[PDB]
Ligand binder design. Structure first.
Ligand SMILES: [Mg+2]
Ligand SMILES: [Mg+2]
Ligand SMILES: [Mg+2]
Ligand SMILES: [Mg+2]
Ligand SMILES: [Mg+2]
Ligand SMILES: [Mg+2]
Ligand SMILES: [Mg+2]
Ligand SMILES: [Mg+2]
Ligand SMILES: [Mg+2]
Ligand SMILES: [Mg+2]
Ligand SMILES: [Mg+2]
Ligand SMILES: [Mg+2]
Ligand SMILES: [Mg+2]
Ligand SMILES: [Mg+2]
Ligand SMILES: [Mg+2]
Ligand SMILES: [Mg+2]
Ligand SMILES: [Mg+2]
Ligand SMILES: [Mg+2]
Ligand SMILES: [Mg+2]
Ligand SMILES: [Mg+2]
Ligand SMILES: [Mg+2]
Ligand SMILES: [Mg+2]
Ligand SMILES: [Mg+2]
Ligand SMILES: [Mg+2]
Lengths: 48, 106, 46, 377
RNA sequence: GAGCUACCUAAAAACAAUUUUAUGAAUCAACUCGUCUAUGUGGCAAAAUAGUGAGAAGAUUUUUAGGUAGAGGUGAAAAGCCU
RNA sequence: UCUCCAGGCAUACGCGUAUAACAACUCGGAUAACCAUUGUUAGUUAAUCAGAAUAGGCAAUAAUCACACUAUAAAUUACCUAUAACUUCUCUGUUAACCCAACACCGGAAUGCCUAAAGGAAAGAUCCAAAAAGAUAAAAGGAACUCGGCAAACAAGAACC
């Protein structure tokens, strides 16, 4: 999720869970030629 | 005492710490081993000369290799030359070599 | 010699000489920012 | 009796025909160079941007790409076609595993993240050295051979062409350059060439894969740096041929991580790609030490074999080099192709409990023994 | 305001070939400089071009980052330099 | 395809979409073709290239192929002792004919490799007037030119204040 605070994690802390996700992505047609397995996406800049 | 310690008095200090007496030269028993022509390896000089050349020049893609590389290379290469004698003397399979091992005593 | 090219760009030099952190280091530099904020400048510092 | 002038293109004109005529001019200076150093110097002195090929690579399906860059057909199995106390070898190899994992006492490294790959290096280093001294009496060649530890093998070649897409050079035709830089964990070099695995001009129905996209789409990146052709030693070294290479796969590519990433089908693919790239460079570099290049293709097939291990599992590969004519010009009418033979990975042992190795498999050891037993004819 | 320039600090670079020797030596490139003449003079250029020249292992040249600020700084003193 | 010319390819710094395709033909290129212009759409993919635990103890012996060899300007975290942790790949740079000089400026611009296999085009068409600029040749003479051998030369040697 973006524009939200992630709880600071220290040794032994819980897992970080996002129940509702603010990330929205779109599948785009490649500009150049890509292998048949490869797929292109446009994703928010804060997504890893 | 560790590897990078350099004794100011050299051998004299080392002898005192270890309570040992120094005799110049190797033991006569060891010397006579290679004096026998039977121990002489085939193409001994030519192979050794190649080992020196390989360690100094031919092993790397660089023009002039550095000591941090050829100094280990020469010794291991020489040991392999001395290890070929398993063709003549068996029972040299009853030994093995390890690398970078720790010794210590008090 | 030909003049006019006294500017040899360098981002490290620029941000060190005229940057936000540099301006706030001394009280006179803080007043540089205060003037520009009062004037309404879109760029307070490099 | 009319001496008509030869119908050839001009040397100095600005055309494609006149450029291909200035290409044969320098290419002829290689043909006419007496020494092999001059030939390799001429062929590599001019640096241009080239794809860097990594034998150990995390890219998907890199094995197929390396076949295309190399013109190699991959055949599953081994190439078509003396008891020496296997138990004695079994004891010695078992001792090596126990010695490093248990008995040896060293200063442990500063990074937890490197303690495992250092264990694998020491055992595979010991195993290779011991198997080279117990098998030496049976195979005298190993006695005079050279054993290299982490020495560099380099091959640089041209294959294919493209149109430069942008800039002042848009539309120009440029070759696709590749270079392989490799540091095999261990390798054995002999001064006499091994026998072939199949006759030159051997023909098989299999077809080398054809890649629609550029090498870039597979993560593969270009750089411009010194072009080098190296076999493990310089041309002056008498030991100018290759017997076997031993490769240790990095932890990043080992079985558990790949399965986690969901690329389970790539576990074997990692082994294949390393062999094709590692052996193609090494067999190719030997050929150019003998004076053979793209315009003087090899007369003798060049052979080498390698064993690839991830520290526990072992796989064995054999390579035969038939073609150095890979460029668009020199590959115009080439029926030859290069061949690589490989097998699935098999465990050599399972675990060490107490001071005994558990699960040791003799079958894999024989394959290592057979590879180390091959000799020149 | 020292991204130019003057000087400095720290960390880095470059110097082929030839002869002397053992070098702020010689011939001469790269590189640095700018002697003499012509062109140019709102010019290609708010100081250049083309030739010709001086140095070219050193008090050499170059790169990067830092320092010294106007009642001042820097100066192998030209009252030079400090956009 | 031909004729001719001879600093090109990378990286650093810098620049910031000038990248590529299409469509346009107003503005921009000192003119056209065509686009470097306008609009629209695309693009640069990295565990290797590049960027971003604590406390003590202790160091005489350059470099130059480092041997010989002398020298003078005197010259580059390691290794140990204890403590602590006990399997990891995310993030960011990646296009181009590009930057500093008001300009698509004959200027300025570090390094590695190489010297033509890479990169380029001096002439829009015509005409051959003067004056002007540049290159080449010179009968006989050879500084008589000129403030002065300036400039040039099939010369570039010698000496003296
Ligand atoms: Mg200005
Ligand atoms: Mg500057
Ligand atoms: Mg400065
Ligand atoms: Mg020199
Ligand atoms: Mg001198
Ligand atoms: Mg001179
Ligand atoms: Mg002089
Ligand atoms: Mg001065
Ligand atoms: Mg005065
Ligand atoms: Mg001024
Ligand atoms: Mg374009
Ligand atoms: Mg158009
Ligand atoms: Mg456009
Ligand atoms: Mg790095
Ligand atoms: Mg680029
Ligand atoms: Mg203009
Ligand atoms: Mg060209
Ligand atoms: Mg023109
Ligand atoms: Mg004309
Ligand atoms: Mg003349
Ligand atoms: Mg005359
Ligand atoms: Mg007169
Ligand atoms: Mg007079
Ligand atoms: Mg004159």
């Amino acid at each position: 999720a973006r524009n939200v605070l992630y709880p600071l994690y220290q040794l032994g802390g819980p897992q970080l869970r996002v129940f509702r996700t603010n990330f929205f992505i779109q599948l785009v047609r490649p500009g150049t030629a890509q292998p048949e397995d490869t797929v292109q996406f446009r994703i928010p800049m804060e997504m890893t | 005492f560790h590897q990078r310690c350099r004794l100011l008095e050299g051998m004299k200090q080392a002898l005192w710490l270890t309570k040992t007496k120094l005799i110049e030269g190797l033991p006569k028993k060891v010397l006579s081993l290679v004096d026998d022509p039977a121990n002489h390896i085939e193409n001994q000089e030519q192979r050794v000369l190649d080992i020196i050349s390989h360690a100094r020049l031919w092993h790397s893609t660089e023009d002039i290799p550095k000591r941090e590389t050829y100094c280990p290379l020469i010794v291991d290469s020489l040991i392999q030359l001395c290890k070929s004698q398993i063709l003549k003397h068996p029972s040299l399979a009853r030994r093995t070599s390890a690398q970078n091992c720790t010794l210590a005593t008090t | 010699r030909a003049r006019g090219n006294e500017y040899q760009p360098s981002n490290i030099k620029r941000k060190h000489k005229h940057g936000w952190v540099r301006r706030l280091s001394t009280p006179a530099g803080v007043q540089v920012i205060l003037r520009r904020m009062l004037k309404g400048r879109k760029s307070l510092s490099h | 009796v009319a001496r008509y002038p030869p119908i050839v293109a001009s040397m100095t004109a600005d055309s494609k025909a006149a450029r291909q005529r200035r290409v044969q001019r320098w290419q002829a200076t290689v043909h006419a160079a007496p020494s092999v150093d001059e030939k390799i110097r001429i062929l590599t002195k001019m640096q241009f941007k080239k794809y860097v090929v990594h034998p150990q690579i995390s890219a998907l399906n890199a094995d197929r790409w390396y076949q295309s860059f190399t013109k190699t057909v991959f055949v599953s199995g081994l190439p078509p076609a003396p008891s020496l106390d296997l138990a004695a070898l079994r004891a010695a190899v078992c001792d090596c595993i126990l010695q490093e994992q248990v008995y040896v006492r060293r200063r442990r490294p500063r990074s937890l993240f490197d303690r495992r790959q250092a264990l694998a290096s020491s055992i595979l280093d010991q195993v290779v050295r011991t198997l080279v001294n117990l098998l030496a009496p049976l195979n005298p060649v190993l006695s005079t051979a050279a054993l290299d530890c982490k020495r560099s093998v380099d091959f640089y070649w041209l294959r294919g062409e493209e149109r430069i897409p942008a800039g002042h050079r848009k539309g120009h035709i440029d070759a696709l350059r590749y270079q392989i830089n490799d540091k095999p964990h261990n390798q054995i070099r002999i001064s006499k060439q091994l026998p072939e695995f199949v006759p030159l001009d051997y023909s098989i129905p299999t077809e080398i894969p054809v890649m629609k996209c550029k090498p870039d789409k597979l993560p593969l990146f270009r750089r411009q740096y010194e072009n080098s052709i190296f076999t493990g030693s310089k041309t002056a070294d008498p030991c100018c041929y290759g017997h076997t290479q031993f490769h240790l796969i990095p932890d990043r590519l080992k079985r558990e991580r790949l399965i986690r990433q969901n690329q389970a089908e790539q576990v074997e693919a990692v082994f294949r790609a390393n062999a094709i790239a590692s052996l193609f460079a090494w067999t190719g570099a030997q050929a150019m030490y003998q004076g053979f290049w793209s315009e003087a293709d090899v007369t003798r097939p060049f052979v080498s074999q390698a064993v690839i291990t991830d520290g526990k599992y072992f796989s064995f590969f054999c390579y035969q080099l038939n073609t150095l004519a890979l460029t668009v010009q020199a590959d115009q009418n080439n029926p030859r192709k290069n061949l690589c033979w490989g097998s699935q990975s098999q465990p050599l042992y399972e675990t060490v409990e107490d001071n005994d190795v558990k699960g040791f498999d003799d079958g894999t050891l024989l394959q290592i023994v057979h590879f180390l037993l091959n000799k020149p004819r």
